[model samples]
Target: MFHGKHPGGLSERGRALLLEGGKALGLDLKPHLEAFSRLYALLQEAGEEEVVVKHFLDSLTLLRLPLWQGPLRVLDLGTGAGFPGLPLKIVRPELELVLVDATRKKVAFVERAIEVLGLKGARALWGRAEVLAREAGHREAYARAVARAVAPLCVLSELLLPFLEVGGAAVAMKGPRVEEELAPLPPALERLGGRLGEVLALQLPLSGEARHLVVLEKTAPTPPAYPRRPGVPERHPLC
Candidate 1:
């Protein structure tokens, strides 16, 4: 069902979980000929799955990728349906993946998927990034943190910067209206011990949709006052 060459298709067993998962997502993948046509080898063949499934699978394009750093750890904030994170773990099974989401159900889905996928060094915790990032165990623990949800860069900087270790990074997936997010990002990053890194333009593999990857590099320890309190950043954010 999957070929080792391209790096995104699920194996025969991996595809089976989608049967139940698709059912859970209320998607029926069996009858669509166009969808099933590419099962022979995936990664590049994304239309083969339902939209919900493809949305997560296609998230693999978010990063141009770092040379498989040995045993790296990653945190996915607001990992709804585990986009970017789950698909990333599928291809780079060696990564230590920690998924955090505000919704219990989404966390449950991610937990189950990780178990069923039989991935190593992976976990799904149900919580918001604001609260969790303050805890001793979670704060500044990750080498990289990623967010796919739409939050203004001001708000996102606070949500993710606290969770990354100094020298770590946060990658946000954004749409074409990227300038709106980037314009005021540097000042906000200044308050959070981070600096705006590269802004790379990428295209979805199968659909050619525009996607932007905003890299935020952590330059120093986030002040204790940061991340302010759960929901506060979202409301006041940064100016």
Candidate 2:
């Protein structure tokens, strides 16, 4: 759930993107468009354009993964305003999704959207992702964990990889310079019991900005030392 205001509602370009953009992904954009319209209307009242076209569409690119089969369990880490996760749930409707964010208001928003959109098999959790990963019930429940606007690959690995079962994956949405980011990630990958699988560069049809999907395969269980409490990973990120 996005606590910020949506500025001026959806611009014509934004509307077009939701409608036409969703279609390109083999989804019927109607329901999503209706939902977006409602969300934009709420944003207008709030006065922030939280759901920008680039961020929204860019998040949608996660669907490009051949690994995203339906009926999968997914955890969306730091799902601010529910970008890829919400959109994926909207389109697929079959994925069992848990959208986690530290902010209660944002989590509330996602919950509201889940209800409004009539999206079944989705839940919102308010807490740090790392702590949630260590909880008993979450152990190896997800087939994939998706994160964006969170951290670089190294730090993100700790936040996301633990929830995935071995052979599951974590999809990190990134920018064009993903190669530069990947260069420093091997050590972190090994430490987290994961491996860099692929880095797929995606070109958004509307914005044409280069986006990336960094997929990490979970090869083994995460070590107990992971997630390293809150500020630790950022202050002393694994090399």
Candidate 3:
């Protein structure tokens, strides 16, 4: 993994961009915020306009969590508008960041945003996790992974664990009542070589909405057949 920096933190200008863009945007972000907020605005324009508020404070959750540590390679599966991953990259400048989404439009926005932001240790890619995990480089390659609004833990574990090296983890941003997910996760985790870690309950910084980050540790390498075909895990999850 790459351990690096690009001046290491946000300039006041960048912070101002985030504060302002959080209000409204047509296009373009400033520096890191310039790069990311533009992409966020474009995505909101694309299809998920209401999704903006739901995601704005994801970085706050990641920042508050203490279970994971640094010098790591991080991935955001289904990155949409680069929430937790992009901002986490800004906050924790020591790590390598990769964002992925199957949608070309969103991935295109992220790819350009990486360059536009002048982010030193980040890249965005387009691919299905099922297929990507079958490859050599991406399979078992990351120290940590995160996903937002993906799927039930039963389905999500399979999608993320393959990209994580053993002893690494996948941290998921989830809804208020995570009880439904927690009830049946152990067996699924066993199948995927992951173990249950902490389920961190948090509030969405300024919004005060209840949230959770379901942390799952990669206890062993995922089996060869995992993730199944393109859509099988979601259709018929390990459960």
Candidate 4:
């Protein structure tokens, strides 16, 4: 049962959908349901439930698996509502996390959550992913980069892989058409000094919808051509 303090003014349908999502994510919703309800309240306040449910919770399926080995330096790109990023940090407090988003308000929200949750070694950075990656003094320093439906494979890789060290990986949470999207990613990966590693298909705990976690391993340094300007990838992808 959720607490009545639905922050985002969640409608009955939205609450129901979140409950269903909790089921799919294999979470014990009874205990933390109120916390999620609170999170939704924030989202509702921000008027971004569509993003919270679709981009945030939906991409969290990757966390259900035994993908992470140990304490990792992780970066979440375009972490608007902190879906997979914030939730993942909540579950694995050991991970040193930096959540990056372009909006000031979203970054502020994440910072507040970090304080409220007493999360250790977590910070939020407000800026473009590419700019943050280049200026954060942590270049190629992370073990993994995670993102939701932020961009196409080409652009997403450019925005994230630069922040990872050689042998690190960029994990993108995607939908059922993962294979189709990935079909055009080989050259881009190569150019970015990375390689497609695996496409792990999974179902959320209670939700039966198909989801995919695409992992791209950074093998070498990215070419200078990457992360072109601000919005070039979306406008003109490598493919």
Give the per-residue lDDT digits (tens) of candidate 3, residues 39-145.
Answer: 45445444132244345545546665664466688889988767677767765677888899988887887776667666788888898999999999899999999
- TM-score of structure candidate 4: 0.81
> Clashes in model 1: which pairs?
35-48
In the predicted model 3, the residue pairs found to clash are: 29-34, 30-34
Please, what are the lDDT tens digits per residue for candidate 1 over residues 86-199? 766665667788988999988887787666556679899999888898899999998888888648888998999999899988888887678877887798898889999888
TM-score against truth, every candidate: 0.79, 0.88, 0.80, 0.81
Query: Which structure is stronger by lDDT: 1 or 4?
Result: 4
lDDT of 4 by residue, 1-239 (tens): 54343334555555666667767676544555455556666555553554455444665566765666678999988888686788777656688899989999889998887776567888998988766666648678899889987887877887888888898988898877776678888888888888998888876544467878889899998776666778777788776
Q: Which ten residues in a row have the lowest lDDT in candidate 3?
A: 1-10
* Candidate 4 Cα errors over 4 Å, as ranges: 1-34, 45-57
lDDT of 2 by residue, 1-239 (tens): 23333354575556766767667755567766766666556434431332465566676788788866779999999997776788778767788999999989888888887777678999998998767877877866789889988988778887888888999998998987776678888888888889998889878756567888899999999888887887677778886
Q: Looking at candidate 2, what is the lDDT of residue 13?
A: 57
Candidate achieving the largest lDDT = 2
Candidate 4's clash total is 9
lDDT for 50 in candidate 2 is 28
Query: Candidate order by lDDT, highest to lowest?
Result: 2, 4, 3, 1
